């Protein structure tokens, strides 16, 4: 199907993008239930522009038109440890994000799950987990707690809940 | 010199909600991260949650999502943690903490006691 | 987000001994030693594991690596009764209360 995001205000079409990766924060807290919880990224710009996976675009929670991995999805953190550092996940396979200029962006669902259970493939094996729960923002302003791009010198807001919403075992 | 200024000692009902604030001053307000640490009488530090005092942007610990929210006002370099949905075993010092660069907490709020009782 | 275990959770130590805390987790070294005293927050006593904070008295150390980590006060003091917490993380340990022996 398609997973349609409501973006303020309306993105022409010509700032469609290809997302190349994403930037997410750890749950903390214990739950201990063998799961472990992720939203988008909790941080700032400091967090984004450490990934060193950007490109031209500036954007949050989410990369747009940015470098791609060789082969596999590959993520990366400072310190896994440290539930206050990001963890900067980088795509092989771009994920198409089509702007109709109606007010809202759309990614195909099929895409998006088989991103995300690669990236739940390689988050199972660095914390050595068995339940990957994507979980939306924990809030913040609206730059951050949406994913939000530049484009043609004018910012855009697109809330990503439906993005961050599934459980993988 | 650091300062954390927290408000002050608050009663409440079971079911209600308190919001406590801490006044930072002495350094540069969004350039450290902000946590909550609340111990209960007699009882250990139970770490909550961290703001990103930058973007707003927040992580609790699972405890507390849904009942816990963390907010901050930049122009004046205050902080607020507010609970909800209170319960009698949520009696404790509230405390603001700000994290250094050595992943320690160098400057703590005096605390903020909150009973909660009817 | 690991579990801190501080023992021993009670130490009677007797004026101008040796006071030892351990402190394990249940998984450079990010260890920070806190002192409690009544109706205060906790205070930083050592961060990075073994480096004192400023105007921490010199009979305070700690050291260890990877797991274990130990707090000593070479000498201990009627001021240094209080609470002891280490903390790695966000994760503190249970506490290690330390009053006089006689």
């Known amino acids: 199907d398609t997973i349609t995001l409501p973006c303020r205000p309306a993105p022409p079409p010509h700032c469609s993008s290809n997302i190349t990766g994403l930037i997410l924060t750890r749950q903390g807290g214990y739950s201990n239930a063998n799961t472990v919880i992720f939203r988008p990224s909790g941080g700032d710009w400091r967090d984004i522009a450490r990934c060193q996976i950007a490109g031209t675009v500036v954007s949050t929670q989410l990369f747009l038109n940015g470098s791609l991995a060789e082969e596999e999805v590959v993520i990366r953190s400072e310190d896994w440890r440290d539930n206050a550092k990001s963890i900067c996940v980088q795509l092989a396979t771009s994920v198409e994000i089509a702007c109709t200029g109606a007010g809202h962006c759309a990614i195909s669902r099929a895409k998006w799950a088989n991103t995300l259970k690669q990236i739940a493939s390689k988050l199972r094996e660095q914390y050595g987990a068995k339940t990957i729960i994507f979980k939306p923002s924990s809030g913040g302003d609206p730059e951050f707690v949406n994913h939000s791009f530049n484009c043609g010198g004018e910012f855009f807001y697109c809330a990503s809940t439906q993005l961050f919403a599934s459980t993988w075992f | 010199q650091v300062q954390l200024v927290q408000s002050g000692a608050e009663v409440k009902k079971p079911g209600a909600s308190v919001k406590v604030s801490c006044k930072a001053s002495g350094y540069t307000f969004t350039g450290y991260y902000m946590h909550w640490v609340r111990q209960a009488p007699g009882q250990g530090l139970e770490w909550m949650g961290w703001?990103?005092?930058?973007?707003?942007?927040?992580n609790y610990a699972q405890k507390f999502q849904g009942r816990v929210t963390m907010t901050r006002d930049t122009s004046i370099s205050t902080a607020y943690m507010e609970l909800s949905r209170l319960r009698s075993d949520d009696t404790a010092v509230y405390y603001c903490?700000?994290?250094?660069?050595?992943?320690?907490?160098?400057?703590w709020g005096q605390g903020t006691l909150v009973t909660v009782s009817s | 987000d690991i579990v801190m275990t501080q023992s021993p959770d009670s130490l009677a130590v007797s004026l101008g001994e040796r006071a030892t805390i351990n402190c394990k987790s249940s998984?450079?070294?990010?260890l920070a030693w806190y002192q409690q005293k009544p109706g205060q927050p906790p205070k930083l006593l050592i961060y990075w594991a073994s480096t004192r904070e400023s105007g921490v008295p010199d009979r305070f150390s700690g050291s260890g690596s990877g797991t274990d980590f130990t707090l000593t006060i070479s000498s201990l003091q009627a001021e240094d009764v209080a609470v002891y917490y280490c903390?790695?993380?966000?994760?503190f340990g249970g506490g290690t209360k330390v009053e006089i022996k006689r």
């Open positions: 703001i990103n005092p930058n973007s707003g942007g927040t």
């Open positions: 998984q450079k070294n990010y």
């Open positions: 903390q790695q993380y966000y994760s």
């Open positions: 903490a700000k994290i250094s660069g050595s992943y320690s907490f160098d400057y």
